[PDB]
Amino acid sequence: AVKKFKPYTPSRRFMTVADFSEITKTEPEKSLVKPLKKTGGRNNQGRITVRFRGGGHKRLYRIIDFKRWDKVGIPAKVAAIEYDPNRSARIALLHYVDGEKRYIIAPDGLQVGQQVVAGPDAPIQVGNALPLRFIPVGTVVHAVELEPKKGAKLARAAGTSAQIQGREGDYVILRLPSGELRKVHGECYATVGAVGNADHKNIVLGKAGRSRWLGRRPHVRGAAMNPVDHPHGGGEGRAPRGRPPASPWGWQTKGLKTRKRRKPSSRFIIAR
Amino acid sequence: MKRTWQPNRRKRAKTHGFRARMRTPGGRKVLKRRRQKGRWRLTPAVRKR
RNA sequence: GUGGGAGAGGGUGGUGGAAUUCCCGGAGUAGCGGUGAAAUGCGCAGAUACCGGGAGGAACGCCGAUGGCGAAGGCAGCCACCUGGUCCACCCGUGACGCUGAGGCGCGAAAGCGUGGGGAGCAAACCGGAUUAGAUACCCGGGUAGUCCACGCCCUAAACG
RNA sequence: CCGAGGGUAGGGCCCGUGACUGGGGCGAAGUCGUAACAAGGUAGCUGUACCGGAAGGUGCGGCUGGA
RNA sequence: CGCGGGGUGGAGCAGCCUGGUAGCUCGUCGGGCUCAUAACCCGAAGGUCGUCGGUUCAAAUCCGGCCCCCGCAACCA
RNA sequence: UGGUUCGUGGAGCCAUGGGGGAAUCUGGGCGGACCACCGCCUAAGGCUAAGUACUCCGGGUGACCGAUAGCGCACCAGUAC
RNA sequence: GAGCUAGCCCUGGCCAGGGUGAAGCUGGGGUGAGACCCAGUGGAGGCCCGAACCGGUGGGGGAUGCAAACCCCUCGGAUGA
RNA sequence: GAAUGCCGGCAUGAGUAACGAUAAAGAGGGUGAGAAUCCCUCUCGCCGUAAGCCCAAGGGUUCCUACGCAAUGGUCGUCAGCGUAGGGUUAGGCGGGACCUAAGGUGAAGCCGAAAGGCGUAGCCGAAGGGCAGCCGGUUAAUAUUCCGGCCCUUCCCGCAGGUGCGAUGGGGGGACGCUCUAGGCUAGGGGGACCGGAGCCAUGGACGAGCCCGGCCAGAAGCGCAGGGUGGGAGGUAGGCAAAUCCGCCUCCCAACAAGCUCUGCGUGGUGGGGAAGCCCGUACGGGUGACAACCCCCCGAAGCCAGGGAGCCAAGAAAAGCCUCUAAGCACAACCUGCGGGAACCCGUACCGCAAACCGACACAGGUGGGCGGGUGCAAGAGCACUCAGGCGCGCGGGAGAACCCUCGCCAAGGAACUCUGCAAGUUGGCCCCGUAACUUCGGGAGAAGGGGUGCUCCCUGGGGUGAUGAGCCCCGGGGAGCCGCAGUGAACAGGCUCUGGCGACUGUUUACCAAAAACACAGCUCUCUGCGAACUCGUAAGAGGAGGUAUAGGGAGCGACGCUUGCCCGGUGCCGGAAGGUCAAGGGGAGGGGUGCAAGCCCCGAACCGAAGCCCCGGUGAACGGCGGCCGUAACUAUAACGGUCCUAAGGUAGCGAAAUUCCUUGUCGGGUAAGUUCCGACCUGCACGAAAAGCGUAACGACCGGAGCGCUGUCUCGGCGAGGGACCCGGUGAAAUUGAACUGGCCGUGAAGAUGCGGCCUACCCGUGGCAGGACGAAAAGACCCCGUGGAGCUUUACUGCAGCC
RNA sequence: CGAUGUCGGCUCGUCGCAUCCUGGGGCUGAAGAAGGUCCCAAGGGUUGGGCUGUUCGCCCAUUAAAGCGGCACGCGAGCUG
């Protein structure tokens, strides 16, 4: 839906906030299962190695369930859907009959009170997790494992999915959010449905501060700098570059493919 | 204005203390040099309890 | 009111095959495209033609009509749900409840605009090849928006009987 | 007290005028081209859209005021 | 003032660096097609190569001096 | 690749990171590519005084200084600062 | 050497008092149901005024200074990057 | 004898500048060898969201006292923060530690690295964070939440007494958390009182008065009382909470739905304890007595603090660990644990003093800098603002005179107002609240404090709302209406916008050259291109490792553009990037035709042609929100002029829209129009754009701006054009007493001359000796071994299709 | 070049005369008035504004006249910037 504001201030005239109506009466989270201390820090042991990180709201990590094959066969009741500061998506709090409480990343269409479960069994319904094999060709799916028993790694961003395209002996072909065509092992779990919160892309930050709230420090142009700092630094009053556009570290930034050629992963990929 | 000396007993101790110098080869040599020199004070005297 | 009937009437969801284009594997060569005639173009870096497999989008051949439905705009593969109008019979009910309609409100082809998706074919713009005195045209080879979906605007028409 | 009016401040409407600019109408025999009327030599007209010295061309759908 | 590039039939360009032959398109002229013009077709004419000098057997061409034209430069003060 | 006077040089010898990879005296290395001949040695385990170096320390002497010299310090100086 | 300064991490503190009055909510009006419109309420905001506080715009002073960046007047921001 | 040489000493300026805020001083007395400077008293002034009091950091004897004045004190000094001596800092309850974890550090296991060393789950370390039992008074010259008095708590350890399966570093619960807005009851704090307490007081015209002045609390267990926070109770089933649990989670029947009940705090009350003014009298450097048997009460205001884990809303979604409760495991249940009661035991360190400053940071008793808490009263709409003032503390450690110039800071000015000037620079004007009333334009919020106005004091009369009180008094906030008084003037002093039109640039709040640039620069939402499939790309590290990210294409990296509106044309020949199992070339290596060297020979040793050989380049395509680029010359219309039109040469293609003498325009003050008496600026136009142009975006744009330009109104000392006044200096006296500079000097003008700018040479003129206050023309005056310039086969930072390497990738 | 501050402005002047005015005068194609042109003569005078940093210059309104030039394009231990 997206919340919109009137221009009672500049920067409030474009600003735009998510709709939280799917956030069920459960705004503060769940101890026990999560949260952990989350360790803010824009850099490695010592030095900054990703520029322009820092500031922005304190967070608690929700330790979510990315391998659903523990509770094969054990169903769970979806108890709530809550805000997760550390991902684009929303998260489902679910209660297993087992007693155990996990969070699943919350797919589009998930309703509270719903039944959900994981395993070879598993009715093909939104919320359920299955090894890729038993899932019908053509169904859209998410939180897909890359290699079996290694955890969900594909399609967890808000409003993303992959679609099952066909099969090939032990592998089923996937069409990933990027549009790539991937052979992913049959035995990999993946949960049916799309991610949801799909209006995430429609949000307009609206002002500088908002950027900072999310811990995004001001990014400065190479043009703004000096020859010591950047290939684009200097010279006089503005300058068009004077070389093929580059990163600060000298590599070209328009076109230069960067995936290494001889990756053994290659023989499992069929697209862009 | 604000000048450059902003005394702190803990800082002076953690930074220039006998135990800090002892911790690394760089520092151990400092004690060696100061000893051979005949320095009355190997490290700065940080006070208080 | 009761009992029916026909229909591309409308909305949503789903699904079928033909063909085009692209990719892949096979087999196969020296030309294929195209026009008034040509050329650009594609083709031994393996084209066109043929077989097989895959993906994707769009439009629904036959039935099909000088035909049907809608108030128009318009609606055409099949299926299901939701739904509007409509005509017939029986003459049961109400009982003048009727007609029109300034404004208002809703609908309103195509093109266009916004945001996002989609993009096989086609194709403004644009580029080449011919044609001409010159072609910013007609013919040919390419090709982008757009054409498709959702939602929101736009309100026009030889919107014509 | 009110009070003609005078002063100050800011608006509304209309008239005149203004370097320059836009298109328009009109003016026997100036320029370029051929758009339309015969299948006008690309049926024409059209709402929209893009492009072009100019008539105009082309795209999309429509129309019979064409076969 | 300095630099380097350019003047060729009526128009716009070739030909020079490897000196001897000046060619291309348009135009102009004569004829045809046409009722007539153009288009189109068939034939033809047309260049002291900016001037002054000499280098050579021979200069559009190579070398100097001027003459117009074009373009760049003229900074640190 | 280093080492040797040796800087690729006709470049051996000695050491070695990489690849290949033996033999036990009729076995193996060297004498400056290489080969023949004549000689010299016996790798892939280790230890080994003495002669040699230095002077915080004690002593001795000086065609060494004599408080701006001589050690930074003749003096509670690596101090005060 | 980050006891200055620049960034970041952890954990605390601070921001007087005034304005302006967003969504929302309630009632009413409207409609087939709406959209929407009125009030009242509500207290939003890199909103406004302005101390503390963080600055350093203009001018004057100061120039062996009070000060190796100061003083006076003036001025920017001040719930937020 | 020179090195702007080095070290030391003493000169010069010079009794010159200064003596560190313009809050400020006067006097009497004392002391002393000596007093503006010490002590005291009176008078005066300054501070008072401090210049007052309490914490912290830092400092470290600076605190108190006695005795001192050589030096330290910008003067003096009997004084001191100085010298000598002695004294002084008292805790189970405050802080820290025998408690806990955060970042981060260390680090067993382990991984890595020539050595040094680097990484690192567990644990350990690590605090203004969590946990955590003392409040009020009295005493010392100097310490007190530490000593003492009262009253009250906490741990342990040992006993008795009564309960119960007790019991882990393990399970679970709890601890436990954001921002903004807040309700209800309280407390702190404050205001008032005809009521209570109290020494005293009638002045100077009147007042012996419901008079003036002063003061009317504090702490406090149990138990209540009032506010409020916390929390459902059973029984089943049980596969999860990494063993086991009765606990916890989940599921299902029931009983509650309430704060009923349990609790747990805050406040009030409370056994008791304690304080207690002005004033007067004393002798202190300061405190002592009396006042007093002090009284110790009633209203009202009221927090930002307390109840607190309170409530509502919002998005950016808000530490961990122990204590604490509970669950069970080994085991042990003569153990142990829980409760009540005694008794015993309770360590280590800090505690002085300074603390917005003369004691900390600035070489100084330096006008600077330094975190937290309290910060009274009246009046001003409010307030931490402003003026005065409580408590409390200061007059800033040189003074005395004078009343020149000139300077600083301040006040006023006739007539005129921007004529001043690069510029209204500066200064004025304006100024708070309340109420009227507000244009273009617009993104419909704004522009808006638009502009422009009016009201503002005091008195009397009438009247309407609340809050606390019972529905009433009072006390307390908000209001309305009517008459009237005074002054030049009623936010009467202090704090408190000048306004408008219009361009340029940038959207906007923001950011920056600490110490000359705050901007039109950076940033910014937003747009686009691009890389990236997850052991992601990329970044740091030799590595291990880490960041990215405990993220996964709606994500992350890189680049450019920079809200938003409309838009972003044509060129792929070159460079880049992307795509091409062909071809050409291409290194090691394979391959050996063939040749050579020694050997009597077997052999050993060398070169070595075909051909097989990658990436790369060449080559073939694509690609411009990739690097970039986007023509010349002729002729033409029936007045001329101009050229829609034609010709031709060239290119990879020859700039479209929009804009244009511009932050771009050389010629230039282009040419017209506008403002003006007059305009090299400005605005609007034209277009011949030297040399705009479409994401190093183009053209616009409401709002915004300590941005830059132009105009106008208002107003004024900027100016005509100055004048007067104030105070701090300046000057004179007393005290103290520097500086750069300095070849030596007995240091005049002109006209010449001289290395070409002479006090110093020539000639002539002038000229008694020495100061003081002033002005700055000169001594090529001081200050910095010119920054500009050049030179040096001097140095650095930066670049690239310079050379040669290296990382890196292939 | 071990430093001679560099435009313009302001302030203060002062000097040359090849004189802008005023005074004296010869020639005039000088009737007069007013001009023109040369000679003598610096004693004194030689305006306020619009534009531009401007010197300069073009304007506006005047004037007896709106002089030219030197003094380190006079003068920053005098000011501005």
Ligand SMILES: NC[C@@H]1O[C@H](O[C@H]2[C@@H](O)[C@H](O[C@@H]3[C@@H](O)[C@H](N)C[C@H](N)[C@H]3O[C@H]3O[C@H](CO)[C@@H](O)[C@H](O)[C@H]3N)O[C@@H]2CO)[C@H](N)[C@@H](O)[C@@H]1O
């Ligand atoms: N005339 C009416 C409107 O204006 C235009 O018309 C104007 C022009 O286009 C037109 O020009 C014509 C030209 O077309 C034609 N080929 C040649 C002719 N000599 C010109 O003629 C014109 O100019 C001449 C002198 O100059 C005058 O005397 C005469 O009146 C006038 N018509 O003359 C008209 C002026 O009168 C549109 N073309 C026309 O269709 C439109 O409806």
Ligand SMILES: [Mg+2]
């Ligand atoms: Mg936890």
Ligand SMILES: [Mg+2]
């Ligand atoms: Mg480290």
Ligand SMILES: [Mg+2]
């Ligand atoms: Mg940036």
Ligand SMILES: [Mg+2]
């Ligand atoms: Mg820069």
Ligand SMILES: [Mg+2]
């Ligand atoms: Mg670089």
Ligand SMILES: [Mg+2]
């Ligand atoms: Mg430039």
Ligand SMILES: [Mg+2]
């Ligand atoms: Mg360039």
Ligand SMILES: [Mg+2]
């Ligand atoms: Mg550059």
Ligand SMILES: [Mg+2]
């Ligand atoms: Mg139907």
Ligand SMILES: [Mg+2]
């Ligand atoms: Mg009937």
Ligand SMILES: [Mg+2]
């Ligand atoms: Mg009708």
Ligand SMILES: [Mg+2]
């Ligand atoms: Mg329509």
Ligand SMILES: [Mg+2]
């Ligand atoms: Mg359409």
Ligand SMILES: [Mg+2]
């Ligand atoms: Mg468009």
Ligand SMILES: [Mg+2]
């Ligand atoms: Mg669209």
